[PDB]
């Protein structure tokens, strides 16, 4: 319980990185979260949106 500050800072940085790397799984209204899965099924005009 003496090194709580450094561990807290490290945990905050790690959780921020984890959230930033997990936000890639969202769709935001798209049909998939992977750009390769969208470019391999749709055309240029329709996938643009």
């Amino acid at each position: 319980s003496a090194l709580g500050k450094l561990q807290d800072v490290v945990n905050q940085n790690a959780q921020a990185l984890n959230t930033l790397v997990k936000q890639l799984s969202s769709n935001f209204g798209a049909i998939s979260s992977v750009l390769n899965d969208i470019l391999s099924r749709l055309d240029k005009v329709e996938a643009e949106v």
Binding site: I31, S40, R41, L42, D43, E46
Partner: protein, 50 residues
Amino acid sequence: ASVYAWNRKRISNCVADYSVLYNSASFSTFKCYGVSPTKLNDLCFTNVYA
């Protein structure tokens, strides 16, 4: 069959060449809602039903 008693045929374990089906101009309505008519030949499918 009728529209209220439509028959569904299971299409599985076969090679599907949608390019020949798309090149045929005998079809009057061909609209895809989740895929493209040109990317069908470069994509696999788990289960196809008509």
